Structure formats: structure tokens, C-alpha cells
């Protein structure tokens, strides 16, 4: 396998190296412009705390935040997202799009109001949580995978477990398979290739979360977990680990 581009943050000293990136001086891993009003520090902050701890491979995660003032450019949804700033085909032939995440009983995500995690910018793939339409029930406490709008997978989301996953996309045949992990364990294909409209960016992957509004939730702190965020092309490493570092087991 090859990495196309790296966004474990290894570079980094802390998340205020995000604010290099600027329209005019697009430097460094990730383009830093789609959260709110306040300071970096308010959405996002790194530490070997917020990391899957198998994953060597990375030297620290990072804490994704939606607070009262995530909001951007007038929006009614909470956003707080990264996106990758790179010259690298990460969107053409087959690549396999890497994240880990994991969410904790403090600050938890609201499971009365939908998020879209990891996904696309015309949302032909991405994770989803929380409650998404009809009546809630047991199905709002579910991660789920989504492929074109549509659940082609999902667990239910308990605290304190990190999530493993890599999404095989092939933007030649238009097909998006699902690979995925708890902790330590290695990648496994959980879903085939499924079709659907792959039309790829300029940049358009949000790693990062964004929260629907629902009408009498009003917004409380979530926290999101990463770490193990990476793009590489010909041949997928299952490793939680990552290229080049022990596998784990």
C-alpha cells in the first residue's frame, strides 16, 4: 500500500497549528474554515487521550466539539469539520478512506437529532447516529453506514468502543464497500461494493461531524473521538496501526 495523504495529526504540536491554514496559504494536512464563531480550541484538541490506543500508528487523537456556537456561515445545523488539504488523487480509481472514532458517556451525542459523520460533500457515503425520521426508538442508538442516504449497515453505539473503518471506494466503477473494526482487531469487509453516484471534490471529504437541528432538543456539548485518519491507495492495510507499525493483533 501507498499513503496518499496522512491526517493523524503527527505533525502537529496541538490543534492551533490548524489555523496556518488560511484561503490564501492553504499549508499543512487539513483545510480549517467550516466551524463557528469561536477560538480552534473551542472545536477541536488533541491528546494521546483521544486516541484508539492500539493505533501506534498515531501519536495523538483528536476531541471534535459541537458546543452553542457551532455554526457556520448561518447555518441551523452544528458543524465542526476538517477537510483534507492535499494534491494527491484521493479521488480517482480505488482508494480506501481511513478513520477511527469513538464517542463517551460525558457530552455524548444526541440520540433525539440526526448527525452525518465522515461524509462526502454530496453525501453518496458517510456514517450516521441518532435519530433520523419516523418515530424514535430503539434505531437512534445505532452507528450506521450509509450508502446514498441509504442504512446498508449499523451497531449499536456503545461508550468507550472505538470504531475501526475504511471505506473502499472505487470512483471508476462508482462502488463503496465497507470496511470495519472494534480496538484492536484487524479491518474485515462487513459490506460489498454497493452503487451509487461517486461524483469526487476539489476537497470534499468532512471529516468531522454535522448535527441536524430537532424541534424541542436544544443543543448541549458532544464530544467526538479521532484518530487513524488517512487515505491510501493499492492495497488495504487492515492493521488499526497503520502502515509501517506492528500489527497489533
Not at 131 to 141: F, K, V
Not at 172 to 182: K, N, Y
Request: charged content about 15%.
Amino acid at each position: 500500500g501507498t499513503i496518499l495523504w496522512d491526517g493523524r495529526f503527527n505533525d502537529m504540536t496541538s490543534s492551533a497549528d490548524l489555523n496556518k491554514w488560511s484561503w490564501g496559504n492553504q499549508v499543512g494536512p487539513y483545510q480549517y474554515y467550516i466551524h463557528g464563531s469561536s477560538p480552534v480550541s473551542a472545536y477541536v484538541n488533541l491528546s494521546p487521550d483521544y486516541k484508539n490506543p492500539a493505533d501506534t500508528g498515531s501519536r495523538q487523537g483528536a476531541k471534535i466539539t459541537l458546543d452553542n456556537t457551532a455554526y457556520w456561515n448561518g447555518q441551523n445545523m452544528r458543524r465542526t469539520e476538517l477537510i483534507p488539504q492535499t494534491t494527491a488523487a484521493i479521488n480517482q480509481g480505488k482508494v480506501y478512506y481511513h478513520f477511527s472514532l469513538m464517542r463517551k458517556d460525558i457530552n455524548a451525542p444526541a440520540t433525539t437529532r440526526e448527525h452525518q459523520i465522515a461524509f462526502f460533500e454530496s453525501h453518496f457515503t458517510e456514517l450516521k447516529s441518532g435519530w433520523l425520521s419516523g418515530a424514535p426508538g430503539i434505531s437512534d442508538t445505532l452507528l450506521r453506514w450509509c450508502v446514498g442516504g441509504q442504512t446498508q449497515w449499523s451497531v449499536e453505539w456503545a461508550a468507550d468502543v472505538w470504531h475501526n473503518v475504511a471505506y473502499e471506494i472505487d470512483f471508476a466503477a462508482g462502488t463503496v464497500g465497507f470496511w470495519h473494526s472494534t480496538g484492536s482487531d484487524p479491518l474485515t469487509r462487513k459490506v460489498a461494493p454497493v452503487k451509487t453516484s461517486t461524483s469526487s471534490n476539489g476537497a470534499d471529504w468532512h471529516v468531522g461531524v454535522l448535527e441536524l437541528p430537532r424541534s424541542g432538543y436544544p443543543d448541549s456539548n458532544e464530544d467526538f473521538y479521532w484518530s487513524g485518519v488517512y487515505i491510501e491507495s493499492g492495497s488495504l492495510t487492515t492493521s488499526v496501526a497503520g502502515p509501517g507499525q506492528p500489527i497489533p493483533g
